[PDB]
């Protein structure tokens, strides 16, 4: 795949199935995330790989978080079923530290950029994924499951796999006119 | 041209930048890359500002004003005013945020931040490069007013552009 083409046509996929990226292709995804821009080279990220019986453990963690948040039956059921929408999930935590010259939001932003880079690396190899978050990124139960300290943040659950639909190449490039001004 | 995977795995920024800046169709490609940022709710929560030629001088004056009104000393004021002349082109990205309970503010800021990275990568993909900068004056009231920021908006980066010269756990 061409680099400019990937960037111009970057699309996510929510319908995902086996096979998951694995072995060297998963390692390529992880290294792409570690190349996220990073003010001060703080490497403010932790990555959790969720696969196989990890998905069942993730289901139990999310259900407990949904119950603890007071969600209704439908929300608890959605949390229970969430991990089985893809064969692999990578949870990205912004691991933040007190650096007076590097604001917290910049460290979080670097972790978020890692998510996007990993989705792009998936796409570049014939896989795809979708960056998901929702209210349970803020659940104490869920954050404790991902070893969050008080200043850390879950910035995404990146669902990964083989997309059921090939990424469309039949769609026009975005229009810049409403978003761009000359300063 | 450039392999997509090699772009991602070897991605690097560049701070030493010179003319020529990307222009014409190559700049348009950079902007279109930013507009493909992941976007929860398709809120399109971004505004881009092209800073070049006389806009660099106007940007310089705005930063100088911000440093001056914050009481910085002469060195800080001069560093602020000189900053835009380190690259032939700068793109300012504003996270233009709206109240949607299903899409918290931080996610919209994230989308705008991802737009910066995508634009930097599009520069790199075309033989240019750049560096995402921010600094303390992104918060300056006069600087935010210069970029039309409402209280809920945020300057997430100044992307300088030109011609260049232990983490993983199994759950
Ligand atoms: C920080 C962040 C959080 C997101 N969270 C969700 C989410 O919880 N659920 C969802 O469907 N999309 C979410 N999205 C949007 C998707 O990742 C994706 O961009 C969306 O499906 C639009 O498709 P596209 O990327 O192909 O344009 C999020 C995006 C960002 C930047
Ligand atoms: C939100 C954000 C703001 C940043 N601001 C600056 C900055 O003001 N000055 C700077 O030298 N680097 C800044 N960086 C880091 C650079 O963009 C770049 O990542 C750094 O020079 C490391 O080079 P590399 O991207 O090639 O790894 C910032 C990064 C992020 C994510």
Q: How was this structure determined?
A: X-ray
Q: Whole-angstrom Cα distance, residue B125 to residue B3?
A: 9
Q: Do A183 and B58 touch (CB under 8 A)?
A: yes
Nearest to B135 by CA among B70, B88, B74, B52: B70
Q: Whole-angstrom Cα distance, residue A107 to residue A99?
A: 10
Q: How far is CA A98 from CA A68, A84, A167, in A?
A: 30, 37, 41
Q: Which of residues 123-162 of B touch A (CB under 8 A)?
A: 124-126, 132, 134, 147, 156
- Is residue A106 within 8 A of residue A155, CB to CB? The reply is no
Give the pairing type, strands A45-51 and B168-170.
parallel
The C-alpha torsion from B119 through B122 and B123 to B126, rounded to 10°, is: -170
- The values of phi and psi at residue A161, to 5°, are 170, -165
Nearest to A22 by CA among A80, A90, A103: A90
Ligand 2: centre distance to CA A37 (Å): 5
Confirm or deny that B58 is annotated as ligand binding.
no
Q: Exposed e or buried b for every residue in B65-104, given b needs 16+ CB within 10 A?
A: bbbbebebeeebbeebbebbebbbbbbbbbbbbeeeeebb
Size of chain B, expressed as the number of residues it contains: 171
Q: Exposed e or buried b for every residue in A146-175, given b needs 16+ CB within 10 A?
A: bebeeebbbbbbbbbbbbeeebeeeeeebe
Nearest to A102 by CA among A144, A17, A41: A41
- Is residue A155 within 8 A of residue A112, CB to CB? The reply is yes
Ligand 2: centre distance to CA A40 (Å): 7
Which helix H or strand E contains B92, and what residues bound it?
strand B89-95
The C-alpha torsion from A131 through A134 and A140 to A142, rounded to 10°, is: -50
Nearest to B161 by CA among B57, B53, B50, B87: B87
Q: What is the number of structural domains in chain A?
A: 1
Q: Whole-angstrom Cα distance, residue A180 to residue B164?
A: 24
Ligand 1: centre distance to CA B36 (Å): 11
Q: Whole-angstrom Cα distance, residue A148 to residue B74?
A: 42
Residue A99 burial by Cβ neighbours in a 10 Å radius (0-12, 13-18, 19+): middle
Q: Do B36 and A176 touch (CB under 8 A)?
A: no
Q: Please give the radius of gyration of chain B, using alpha carbons only, rounded to the nearest integer.
A: 17
Residue A76 tokens, joined:
């608890």
**Chain centroid, CA B73 distance in Å:** 26
Nearest to A161 by CA among A90, A112, A60, A91: A90
Residue A11 tokens, joined:
């699309």
Half-sphere exposure of A181 (CA within 13 A, CB side): 9
B64 Cβ inside 6 Å of ligand 1: no
- Is residue B38 within 8 A of residue B111, CB to CB? The reply is yes
Which residues make beta-bridge pairs with A175? none
- Is residue B125 within 8 A of residue B22, CB to CB? The reply is no
Which residues make Cβ contacts (< 8 Å) with residue A71, sequence separation at least 6?
A: A79
Q: How would DSSP label each residue in chain A?
A: -BHHHHHHT----S-EESPPP-HHHHHHHHHHHTTS--TTS---EEEEEEETHHHHHHHHHHHHHHHHTT--HHHHHHHHHGGGGSSEEEEEEE-----TTS-HHHHHHHHHHHHHHHHHHHHHTT-EEEEE--GGGG-HHHHHHTT--TT-EEEEEEEEEEESSPPP--SPPPP-GGGEEE-
Which residues of chain B neighbour A35 with C-beta distances below 8 Å? Answer: 8-12
Q: Which domain holds residue A56?
A: 1-183
Nearest to A120 by CA among A15, A45, A30, A14: A30
Report yes or no: B44 at the A interface, CB cutoff 8 Å.
Answer: yes
Q: Is the dihedral of CA B41, B135, B78, B14 positive or negative?
A: negative
Report yes or no: B48 at the A interface, CB cutoff 8 Å.
Answer: yes
**What is the number of the ligand 1 atom nearest to the C-alpha of B107?**
1
- Supply the DSSP symbol for B139: G
B122: three-class secondary structure by DSSP: helix
Q: Whole-angstrom Cα distance, residue A137 to residue A146?
A: 10
B129: three-class secondary structure by DSSP: strand
Which helix H or strand E contains B114, and what residues bound it?
helix B105-125
Q: Which residues line ligand 2 (CB under 6 A)?
A: A 37-39, 106, 109-110; B 12-13, 113, 131-135, 157
- Is residue A171 within 8 A of residue A9, CB to CB? The reply is yes
CA of B167, closest CA in chain A: separation in Å? 5
Scan for tokens 């703080």, then name that residue: A42
CA of A61, closest CA in chain B: separation in Å? 11
Closest CB to A181 among B6, B36, B49: B49
Which residues of chain B neighbour A49 with C-beta distances below 8 Å? Answer: 168-171
Residue B27 burial by Cβ neighbours in a 10 Å radius (0-12, 13-18, 19+): buried
């Amino acid at each position: 795949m061409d680099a400019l083409d990937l960037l111009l046509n970057r699309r996510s996929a929510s319908r995902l199935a086996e096979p998951a990226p694995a072995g060297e292709q998963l390692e390529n995804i992880l290294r792409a995330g570690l190349r996220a821009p990073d003010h001060g080279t703080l490497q403010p990220w932790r990555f959790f790989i969720i696969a196989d019986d990890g998905r069942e453990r993730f289901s139990q963690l999310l259900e407990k978080g949904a119950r603890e948040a007071g969600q209704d039956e439908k929300g608890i059921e959605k949390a229970r079923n969430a991990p089985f929408r893809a064969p692999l999930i990578i949870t990205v935590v912004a691991r933040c530290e007190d650096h007076p010259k590097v604001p917290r939001w910049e460290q979080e932003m670097s972790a978020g950029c890692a998510v996007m880079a990993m989705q792009m690396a998936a796409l570049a190899q014939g896989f795809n994924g979708i960056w998901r978050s929702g209210a349970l990124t803020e659940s104490p139960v869920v954050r404790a499951g991902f070893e969050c300290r008080e200043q850390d943040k879950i910035v995404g659950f990146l669902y990964l796999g083989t997309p059921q639909l090939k990424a469309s190449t039949t769609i026009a490039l975005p229009d810049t006119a409403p978003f761009v001004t000359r300063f």
